[PDB]
């Protein structure tokens, strides 16, 4: 049951979430204040629902929605945590993972009491491919482009003739980043955050991966590398910014 | 909207052909048709589908009466809303189809039913072993495996089981995959997806002696592990805990998803 939502002094015990390997979730990693996280790697790998405790720090291995995990599966792993008062984050965030509404219900269904901590408008433009390519060639920024979009690929081969289209980085006029509709959105986002370069992209997964503007905006939240996100119409700018700011 | 469900009474495939001849098949990103949709085929030319591969989710391909749609994968993160949206990309007509996205970690029968019911198109839906279910413990299963020479899928991340294995089969080098040492073992992790393990076992097509893959180890309860076990095509002896669980597991296996 969600006792309160923060909008730490005073109450003790924290509830952190980790994966099978033992790596903590992004939201739960930020909750740390330089504590000894050696106890978590000492018993790795874990099964879904495994509870690890070291004093006040309590960790639970939760199922991954992007890996097929269900709401019922998450709620069941949360029931394995010993009933107490905890300061936590929302479990399973965020690209292709559990939504804020799904995570809220999971915590509310649990017998334990929770104090839940919460999880750019300027970067949202309305540029077409021609406009974006001009920006990319001058700024020397990386341009994430879906290889499986024939219409876009044609424009690229016509403007940048002699290009050898291959997966990943292709520096030929524009520093392109070619991704497939085969490769998961969370996998592409992980690859771009690792590179930590300035970007000029469209909402990753929109159309190409079966996402509508709302869904692609939720995955874009997990993008940490500075980016210029381009949407179709100028009317879509405010919409995309609405889906980005609001709840999952 | 699901107009009717084929049951042999009082709606047959031959009977429904008067209403429509158009079929709705489902495929993945690569262009490979789903298991349920592959069985619907009667020796038709499926070359048109590989001619424009790879596809994006929601891509509609038509060759006369045969209509194909690339649907999202639930095991790959796909949602109910995403499937319903890809189905809305199909041109509104009367179709003979199967349930989309079956079955290991994919969409349930209840979720697929709603997706078709939400769509503007009318559908004539075709439907998607008790003998293999035993109640043996590890000691019992290992004896069966060493004599029958069958493959034994074992979760590496279960310390209790690993201890028993190293004690009975001393000098064993536990590694991922096939380890033939007394028993032809198949070591899998809780890291590797259930649908990925099942795909690996169907490919090997060997006789098996296993527990319901994913149960406990992957966060599944008996009901959920039974749904994934449906997709196991390689001959297997599925062992459950108690003899009281045998009928339960067989119940979850026979019934709807």
Author numbering:
A (entry chain D): 389 to 395, 405 to 516, 524 to 652
B (entry chain A): 389 to 516, 524 to 652
What does the paper say about this structure?
SUDcore turns out to consist of two subdomains, SUD-N (Nsp3 residues 389–517) and SUD-M (525–652), each exhibiting the fold of a macrodomain. The two subdomains are connected by a flexible linker (residues 518–524) and a disulfide bond. Instead, we have demonstrated that full-length SUD and SUDcore bind oligodeoxynucleotides and oligoribonucleotides that form G-quadruplexes.
In this communication, we describe the crystal structures at 2.2 Å and 2.8 Å resolution (monoclinic and triclinic form, respectively) of the core of the SARS-unique domain (SUDcore, Nsp3 residues 389–652). Both structures were determined by molecular replacement. The r.m.s. deviations (on Cα atoms) between the models derived from the two different crystal structures are around 0.7 Å. In both crystal forms, SUDcore displays the same head-to-tail dimer, with the SUD-N subdomain of monomer A interacting with the SUD-M subdomain of monomer B, and vice versa. Due to the two-domain architecture of each monomer, the resulting four lobes give the dimer a quasi-tetrahedral shape. As to be expected, the structures of the monomers are very similar to one another, with r.m.s.d. values (for Cα atoms) of 0.58 Å between monomers A and B of the monoclinic crystal form, and 0.11–0.37 Å between monomers A–D of the triclinic form. In all six independent copies of the SUDcore monomer, residue Val611 adopts forbidden conformational angles. One potential binding site for G-quadruplexes might be in a cleft between two consecutive SUDcore dimers as they occur in both the monoclinic and triclinic crystal forms, but for confirmation, any of these models will have to await crystallographic determination of the complex.
